[PDB]
Amino acid sequence: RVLDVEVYSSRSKVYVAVDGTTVLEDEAREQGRGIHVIVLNQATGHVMAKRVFDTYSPHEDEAMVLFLNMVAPGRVLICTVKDEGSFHLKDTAKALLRSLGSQAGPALGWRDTWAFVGRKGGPVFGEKHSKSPALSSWGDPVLLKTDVPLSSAEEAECHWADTELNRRRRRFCSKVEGYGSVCSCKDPTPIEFSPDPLPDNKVLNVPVAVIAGNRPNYLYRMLRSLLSAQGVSPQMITVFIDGYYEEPMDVVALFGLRGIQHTPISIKNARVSQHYKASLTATFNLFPEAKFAVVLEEDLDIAVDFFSFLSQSIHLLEEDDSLYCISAWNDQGYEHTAEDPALLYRVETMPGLGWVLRRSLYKEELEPKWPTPEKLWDWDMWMRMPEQRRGRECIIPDVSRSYHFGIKHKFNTVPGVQLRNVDSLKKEAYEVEVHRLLSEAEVLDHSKNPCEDSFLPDTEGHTYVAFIRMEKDDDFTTWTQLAKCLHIWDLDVRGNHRGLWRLFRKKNHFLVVGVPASPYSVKKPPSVTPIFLEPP
Numbered sequence: 001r002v003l004d005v006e007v008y009s010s011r012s013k014v015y016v017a018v019d020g021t022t023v024l025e026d027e028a029r030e031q032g033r034g035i036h037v038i039v040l041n042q043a044t045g046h047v048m049a050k051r052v053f054d055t056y057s058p059h060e061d062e063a064m065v066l067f068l069n070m071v072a073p074g075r076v077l078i079c080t081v082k083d084e085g086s087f088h089l090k091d092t093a094k095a096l097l098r099s100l101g102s103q104a105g106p107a108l109g110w111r112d113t114w115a116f117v118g119r120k121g122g123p124v125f126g127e128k129h130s131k132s133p134a135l136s137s138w139g140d141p142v143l144l145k146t147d148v149p150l151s152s153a154e155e156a157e158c159h160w161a162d163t164e165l166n167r168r169r170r171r172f173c174s175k176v177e178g179y180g181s182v183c184s185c186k187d188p189t190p191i192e193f194s195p196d197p198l199p200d201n202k203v204l205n206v207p208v209a210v211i212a213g214n215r216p217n218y219l220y221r222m223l224r225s226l227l228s229a230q231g232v233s234p235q236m237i238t239v240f241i242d243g244y245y246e247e248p249m250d251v252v253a254l255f256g257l258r259g260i261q262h263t264p265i266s267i268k269n270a271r272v273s274q275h276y277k278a279s280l281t282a283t284f285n286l287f288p289e290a291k292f293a294v295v296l297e298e299d300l301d302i303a304v305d306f307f308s309f310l311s312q313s314i315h316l317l318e319e320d321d322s323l324y325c326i327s328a329w330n331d332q333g334y335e336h337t338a339e340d341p342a343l344l345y346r347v348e349t350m351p352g353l354g355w356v357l358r359r360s361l362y363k364e365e366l367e368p369k370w371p372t373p374e375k376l377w378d379w380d381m382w383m384r385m386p387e388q389r390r391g392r393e394c395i396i397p398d399v400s401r402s403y404h405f406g407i408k409h410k411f412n413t414v415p416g417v418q419l420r421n422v423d424s425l426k427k428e429a430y431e432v433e434v435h436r437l438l439s440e441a442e443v444l445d446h447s448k449n450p451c452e453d454s455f456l457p458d459t460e461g462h463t464y465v466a467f468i469r470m471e472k473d474d475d476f477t478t479w480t481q482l483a484k485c486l487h488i489w490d491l492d493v494r495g496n497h498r499g500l501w502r503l504f505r506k507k508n509h510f511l512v513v514g515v516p517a518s519p520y521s522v523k524k525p526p527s528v529t530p531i532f533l534e535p536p
Contacts, residue, residue: 003045003148007080009113009130010141014082018045026082034060035085038078039071039177042119043156045148048075048177056084061093068096070180072173073121074156076148079105080115104129113139117146158185165191172254176247179220182254191254193224196415198231202311203294206356207287209279210239212298216247219298221405223255226296230415231307238286239298240279242271265373273379277370284359292317293357296402300354303328303401304415310356312419313344313395317358320426324361324392328354328401330410331494332503337486338410339504342420343398346430347495350384350394354402393497395425398504434500438523441465441511446528451485456505463509467524469532470499470514479514481533 006017013027016038026032033056039049049071053064071077077100086108097105101124102116111132118124126146130139158173160166169191173183181189208226212219219239227234238258241248252259260282265274283293292314296302303309306328317323329351330338366388371377382388397419403411424433441463448455456464468478476493479501483490486505495501499518503510515521515530524530
């Protein structure tokens, strides 16, 4: 058979139509702006992808050239511009549009209305161009009646060997486009992974909760990092999606993981908060013998040794009840302030971004008092308030084991790292080592400037101390200002332990103590006057 595709380019609206039923409209007044790309398979005409690219605005043309390159060849692409798409098209995008046999596309100019439907890899089916006769005038709205030959059920599909990876590959690859080489006949990229097994692994039977929304592109990247991490048990992973969006679920099914959907109790940050609640209770219901639960969000890269790092450290959670969590994320650990991968800290905060929650804490304290949907509080800020944290601390590594790729942070690439002196992070033993470190550490010149490298001797390996004005345990004026000029996280006050911040400057360990609030002011010579910085 053959498909009557109807595409339409206009000033304020834009639509497509596949055998009588239009699968995308957009008469909205301020939005949708740029080229709209819709993608429908070549043997049934089902939509596999829907896109918008603001090439009226800079650099979205680069998003489009990428995406069209990720679309499998043979595939009928339809384009239909509205409002304006010329302004930042650039030679590269016009070149790709030429490649797909479009000639009115590469010559697209100011506020033109242009519609193109055609096959990727030839040939062209219908192109329709409209020229803006004046610069305030626009291309007369265009409508393009093309009939599009339907291919065999066999020529649209990729004939791989019948491995059931490739069975789930085909169920994904025939449903959504834009994921590229995972859906390409030749050189098909892997859909399961061969992570080196971690021996002595204590995190075997800890569930992994993946908190995801309608960002399938992020979640695909996330899961590939995760299922590649040393010692993963995909059995224990379940991806909680907040909504009934099918594309994020198809990515879950592509890797063959367990996917839970949740009806969005809204609004805003309350809505995220309720998804976290729902997902957490759900994880402990799917795994009632589970003492802990790993919580990862979909916008995170998972370091190679992430489960190596948890297995070594998780005994601390049950042996030390003054611990709130274990986190993979050092707020202060950027590439220039973090160095030791074997090293661990205690901090009086709850960083999130890949963390371990203990079952007892959740069902005995947190879940009963979890904020109602009426209140628009961030879940993590609420978990960091003293009624929830109750003065407990979180284990973090100096080099993080998660990377946040949403929308310069140091991230561990070395695998199978042996953490040093793990048991020295129980409450009292950590205090032993802290004092130990201040007794061996060389005090600095506190009349020299702390914001420049001049502050630290030109050396590597030594450990140093600086003292800053912290009048109360609530006075972070000087530290916030300090934080800014070393170019690390500055907004809120993170990584403090009894008034002590641990960081690295110029490959040397570097200790900041707030005087007099911190109980470590005892280590400060009377000669030294505590450093103080004011803001504006």
